[PDB]
Design a protein around this ligand. Structure first.
Ligand SMILES: CCCCCCCC/C=C/CCCCCCCC(=O)OC[C@H](O)CO
Ligand SMILES: CCCCCCCC/C=C/CCCCCCCC(=O)OC[C@H](O)CO
Ligand SMILES: CCCCCCCC/C=C/CCCCCCCC(=O)OC[C@H](O)CO
Ligand SMILES: CCCCCCCC/C=C/CCCCCCCC(=O)OC[C@H](O)CO
Ligand SMILES: CCCCCCCC/C=C/CCCCCCCC(=O)OC[C@H](O)CO
Ligand SMILES: CCCCCCCC/C=C/CCCCCCCC(=O)OC[C@H](O)CO
Ligand SMILES: CCCCCCCC/C=C\CCCCCCCC(=O)OC[C@H](O)CO
Lengths: 444, 444
């Protein structure tokens, strides 16, 4: 596999061309997932509001336990990028990462469903909503090892620098997901109506199809890399070392976010609904920085593996400036046109005003988020996965949650947590920039 | 601080003398914790069975969230042993480890109680039991940062090789704990009866006293090391890197153990009660291997930091064989006298029969546990904290839980999970030994 080297004095537009080629397929992958989940929500709402509640609770808890996938994703992803940059054969990384992903899926396969329903009992779901959720989750947990394996293929491609092939798989996966769920929920074309169980099968069947395509490309075209059947315990242990802080950051971020949202829950259903609407609107801004973050791990990792440290820094700094310009635009749009963006979601005047204030406050923070996304990705590509764990969790609690806790005792307004959200985002970018300079300085 | 160097050709009895001098105070600390927890349970039983239920649920969930303490414990503990061995000034490690322990406590201080009660509203409690638990947990969470700080003092001593000073603090702490709870529960002297809240204050006040003693020794006698007020972000990040896998191993082990105990819950209350009785009996044998594990981290870390790799290996191998001899004896007691050990716990004939069968099955496994305990502690002292995470969790699921899941479909007997428990303990010892040889082999 050929590397994506960035030369220390490469012109700006030639670096961006490489960044955009990597980043656009990941942004597409992410936006297909957003569109699919929106369509899947409408399909389930054709059943009953208890069905919507069951899948709503299910998806949030599934998102939590999916933190585990970051372990096998990150270890495989980082090491393949570094090996490609060092001109080493990455085939051992691919096979051990897939086996590791399969292994860590097994506790979720054997007892993840009970754990989810257990953690659903807690949130105050009726036993009817939990009984529907158990039907929805049954096919999902039957094939959760397939989900782990396809997520690790995704990481192998991305680290290898071929983000287009997972985008191709994602297009087919997402049509299969929507077509299956639509067919099995409504019982279309002389097929039995399965209810929420049909929405679950849509996830399982699309994952099985993704896995078959990945495996077909592996056996017959040698994937990103040829298949070699040999486990290497030293690589398994290195992948665990790399991926464990990433899995932990995702799990702890979700818990921290639950705490923070509770601050808005105390303002009533309308402030809470506006926060959610503002979040899903803000996440089209999110996916851009998230895709270039993926791309930053590939670029940083490959150039780090090549010991091309000056070119690695050049790639990261150029990427960061470019993504901060793009998100200056998306942020400007959030500040200027919030009533247009909110309009498709609700018509409650009072909800429109809160969500619009949310979008405006956070739109200021979009360029900072771009900086945090890219420096985080660059540190992961260097193998420093414990650094985004420390930066993200310490920033979240010290500059967002705890200041909100104390000032909300004096100022009873949702603008308080929302204002600290944008303050913390700016602080966290400065934090990442500071640590990145010191890390790169020792490297140079 | 002087190092506990082990020379490569040191006579066996001179190595054991060093091991026993380190290990005995830790074993005392652990057994004082066992005696206190028993006395505290009897004090609460003077209130009501719902009070016992509230503290039982509380203590089990507290043990889970205490997984976090391992992050700051392990980072401070390991780096101090290595710095002492390398004859470097460990004062920076002590101060940043305390600050880090304070920091990671803060999310529990602000929302841990709700999380616990959230996580209790599930195990099948009740709003009466949960309302008592909330009274018990209120003083505990008010001073949870003090608990984190005292646990990190404990680790600094242990790594420095002075295990006697925390044993002294533990004696005073445990008397304070029992005297306070007894006073406040029974309303002794001129104090009002506070109910289960009085047991919570017993924890808080004794932790406060332990912290004051530690802090007094720091300021006036220079603790294990003098106080230097300067945070070092580079040390904080290394401590996070070291401690994160240990915290995650503890959290995941607890969850895995919950899955495994559920296999025995399906056999009824009497098979379940016998398993618990067998566990608390096995745990006086546990504390021996656990204390020598702490000592192994100190000995391995200091000799690793001294680059005295042959002496490090010699210390670990001598420690392992000696501890396996000691636990061969404790295991022989479990196999030979189970009805005597069970007698003080229950008089139900079927419970005595199951618990006795548990002790016999388990007694075989005691020398294997000693080997796993010591190799694990040695790998932690070398900074390889991700290895016990990988070895423990993979062994637990692949050789205990999953084989039990399948054979329980054919053989409906508690001997099945209990027999795989001893089988898995033996495999995990061989696993650790294999990994330890390859790690030290490269070192030599
Ligand atoms: C992973 C740590 C973050 C934890 C939470 C971050 C909150 C904001 C998330 C933005 C990502 C895109 C939003 C998608 C959120 C998916 C989780 C979820 O709520 O479940 C699906 C939901 O029901 C259907 O919108
Ligand atoms: C594999 C499909 C079955 C899973 C069901 C949908 C999963 C949502 C998308 C996950 C990867 C895409 C996110 C971009 C890759 C980031 C690294 C990763 O894959 O981790 C997953 C994430 O942390 C989890 O919370
Ligand atoms: C589980 C919760 C996660 C832990 C939350 C507690 C947070 C405490 C703060 C830590 C600061 C660490 C960030 C500082 C990073 C410094 C990295 C660095 O400077 O390294 C440069 C080096 O020269 C190149 O190799
Ligand atoms: C001194 C009071 C400290 C605050 C209250 C603690 C109570 C639990 C006892 C810990 C003794 C330490 C024995 C183990 C030595 C390692 C320290 C540790 O990490 O404890 C975390 C453990 O894994 C949890 O799940
Ligand atoms: C959630 C985590 C659960 C994981 C579930 C599957 C894990 C399977 C892997 C086992 C590898 C253990 C083998 C360790 C290999 C030895 C490491 C080594 O050789 O180290 C040499 C050198 O000293 C550098 O540290
Ligand atoms: C198979 C080879 C080793 C695999 C490596 C493991 C990967 C790490 C898994 C971590 C989460 C464990 C999830 C276990 C399922 C939920 C745990 C649980 O206990 O849920 C029940 C609840 O406690 C009722 O009280
Ligand atoms: C503050 C200083 C910054 C350093 C911070 C490092 C400590 C982070 C480590 C673990 C936090 C785990 C999160 C614990 C918070 C409780 C989570 C919770 O209560 O969530 C409720 C539940 O989600 C409702 O549905």
């Amino acid at each position: 596999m050929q590397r994506i080297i960035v030369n220390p004095n490469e012109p700006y537009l030639s670096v961006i061309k490489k960044v955009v080629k990597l980043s656009i397929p990941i942004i597409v992958v992410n936006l297909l997932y957003t569109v699919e989940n929106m369509i899947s929500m409408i399909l389930v709402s054709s059943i009953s509001p208890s069905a919507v509640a069951a899948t709503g609770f299910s998806l949030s808890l599934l998102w939590f336990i999916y933190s585990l996938m970051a372990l096998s994703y990150s270890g495989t992803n980082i090491l393949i990028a570094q090996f490609v940059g060092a001109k080493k054969d990455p085939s051992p990384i691919l096979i051990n990462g897939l086996f590791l992903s399969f292994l860590i899926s097994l506790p979720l396969f054997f007892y993840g469903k009970d754990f989810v329903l257990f953690l659903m009992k807690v949130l105050g779901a009726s036993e009817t909503v939990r009984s529907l959720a158990k039907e929805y989750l049954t096919p999902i947990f039957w094939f959760i090892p397939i989900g782990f394996l396809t997520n690790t293929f995704y990481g192998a491609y991305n680290g290898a620098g071929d983000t287009k092939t997972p985008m191709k798989v994602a297009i087919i996966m997402n049509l299969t997901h929507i077509g299956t769920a639509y067919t099995l929920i409504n019982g279309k074309f002389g097929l039995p109506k399965l209810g929420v169980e049909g929405a679950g099968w849509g996830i399982a069947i699309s994952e099985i199809l993704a896995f078959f395509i990945y495996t077909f490309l592996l056996i017959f075209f040698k994937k990103p890399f040829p298949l070699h059947l040999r486990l290497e315990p030293k690589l398994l242990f290195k992948m665990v070392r790399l991926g464990t802080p990433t899995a932990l950051e995702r799990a702890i971020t979700t818990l921290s976010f639950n705490v923070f949202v509770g601050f808005l829950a105390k303002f009533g259903d309308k402030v809470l609904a506006a926060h959610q609407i503002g979040l899903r609107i803000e996440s089209i801004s999110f996916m851009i920085g998230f895709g270039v973050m993926i791309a930053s791990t590939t670029l940083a990792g490959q150039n780090y593996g090549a010991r091309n440290y000056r070119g690695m820094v050049h790639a990261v700094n150029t990427s960061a400036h470019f993504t901060a310009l793009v998100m200056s635009l998306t942020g400007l749009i959030l500040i200027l046109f919030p009533h247009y963006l909110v309009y498709p979601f609700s018509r409650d005047p009072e909800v429109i005003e809160w969500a619009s204030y949310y979008l405006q406050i956070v739109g200021i923070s979009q360029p900072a988020m771009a900086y945090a996304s890219i420096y985080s990705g660059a540190l992961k590509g260097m193998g420093k996965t414990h650094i985004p764990l420390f930066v993200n969790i310490s920033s979240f609690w010290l500059f967002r949650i705890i200041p909100s806790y104390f000032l909300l005792k004096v100022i009873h307004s949702p603008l308080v947590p929302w204002g600290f959200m944008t303050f913390e985002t700016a602080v966290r970018a400065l934090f990442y920039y500071t640590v990145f300079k010191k890390v790169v300085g020792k490297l140079l």
